[PDB]
Design a protein around this ligand. Structure first.
Ligand SMILES: CC(C)Oc1ccc(-c2nn(C3CCN(C)CC3)c3ncnc(N)c23)cc1
Ligand SMILES: CC(C)Oc1ccc(-c2nn(C3CCN(C)CC3)c3ncnc(N)c23)cc1
Ligand SMILES: [Mg+2]
Ligand SMILES: [Mg+2]
Lengths: 218, 221
């Protein structure tokens, strides 16, 4: 989560492996309709509870999409259509902290040879520094995210760890990610504080752990 | 959520008045970087608890993007790049139920002069037929939906309603041709509804049920 961002500029977006524009044409109950959407990948998330530190493991990082959307709120029109000349430097622009979010460890399912559990284990090592095995993972929920513009499905896993599995670092492969250990005592106040940029996966992860897992511990 | 879907095809979308893909170029830790994202407005959601029926109020509708993703999920390559020879008929296709989702009532922060609570009330009227008062909405949470591809912020509201407050029809706006069905989920079987993986549900529904049962339901009796 290196909040140090410079040279922020918005340019044209032609072709991406992550954003593929498509149109579904269809008839619903006889009525001809169309819908423009983006083909994107499914994903997985994992909530880790470190029972030694009595803390939940989260990740903090810079999200360029969040930063861009935040520049638009405080300076309307900053994200207008870019001409063919080249990327337009965002002026005025916000500090990189505007794009800094707190999330669950997450990763895309964009490699055909890895299971959902294997993607979750790979991401927990690269981002959080914890050694996980697929047999240590439990499925919490599988849901659809962004039903309006994408049909992506995200699967949330839960797992319990100690420092004995933190045999190395996260922070991406080098990617700049800061690992966050949230003590259980202040976890609910963390999730409810709008001053922190959080995802729904974090709010639900914390809420689900405290209401269903924590009362059955010890 | 009429599940009769026919003629499903996928077409190239070169120019879309609804899609706004952009790329952010920036400098971080001294190493030039780029990121592909979509400019989307913010949104609101509202969870309703009908005390007269002791049921949470949800919406069910056909989501074309969800349908396409499920066809692709069962038949990879269904959404391969489309050539210039018109729309490509989806063959094989799936029954329309594969795109039918259960969601919370939700709308976009696009109408000027309307606060977040108002936009939520208008969506509850247009989609669920309930007439709400904005000052009666309790703010549950505010958060960044889809941080990887969008910078949109979503705010969730909650309020209790009665049968008498359902002073409007259902369905949404017929201007877009929307076909939205209202669902009343009984309270004693709501958690099993959110855990059963055999229904296309959003995280907002799963969190909404969980939050209601642990933060609102004990204080009712
Ligand atoms: C935020 C999200 C959960 O809700 C949405 C998002 C987009 C559309 C949409 N609405 N529309 C209309 C616009 C104008 N009306 C008259 C016809 C079609 C689209 N068209 C192409 N792609 C589309 N994703 C849409 C609807 C609901
Ligand atoms: C919530 C999360 C699971 O969703 C994501 C995550 C990352 C990207 C993305 N990741 N990347 C690269 C970054 C550098 N390398 C090392 C990894 C992939 C992108 N590049 C351009 N646009 C992009 N939307 C991306 C998209 C969606
Ligand atoms: Mg990763
Ligand atoms: Mg609507």
């Amino acid at each position: 989560s290196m909040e140090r961002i410079e040279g922020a500029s918005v340019g044209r977006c032609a072709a991406s492996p992550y954003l593929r524009p498509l149109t579904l044409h269809y008839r619903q109950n006889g009525a001809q309709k169309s819908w423009d959407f983006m083909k994107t990948h499914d994903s997985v998330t994992v909530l880790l509870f470190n029972s030694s530190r009595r803390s939940l493991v989260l990740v903090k990082q810079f999200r360029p999409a969040v930063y861009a959307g935040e520049v638009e709120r405080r300076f309307p029109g900053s994200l207008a259509a870019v001409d063919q000349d080249g990327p337009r430097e965002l002026q005025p622009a916000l500090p990189g902290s505007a794009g800094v979010t707190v999330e669950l460890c997450a990763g895309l399912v964009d490699q055909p040879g890895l299971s959902l559990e294997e993607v979750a284990c790979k991401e927990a090592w690269e981002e959080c520094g914890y050694h996980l095995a697929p047999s240590d993972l439990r499925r919490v929920a599988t849901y659809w995210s962004g039903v309006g513009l994408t049909g992506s499905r995200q699967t949330m896993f839960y797992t319990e760890v100690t420092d004995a599995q933190r045999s190395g670092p996260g922070g991406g492969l080098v990617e700049l990610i800061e690992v966050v250990h949230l003590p259980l005592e202040g976890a609910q106040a963390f999730a409810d504080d709008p001053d922190i940029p959080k995802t729904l996966g974090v709010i639900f992860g914390v809420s689900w752990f405290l209401s269903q897992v924590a009362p059955n511990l010890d």
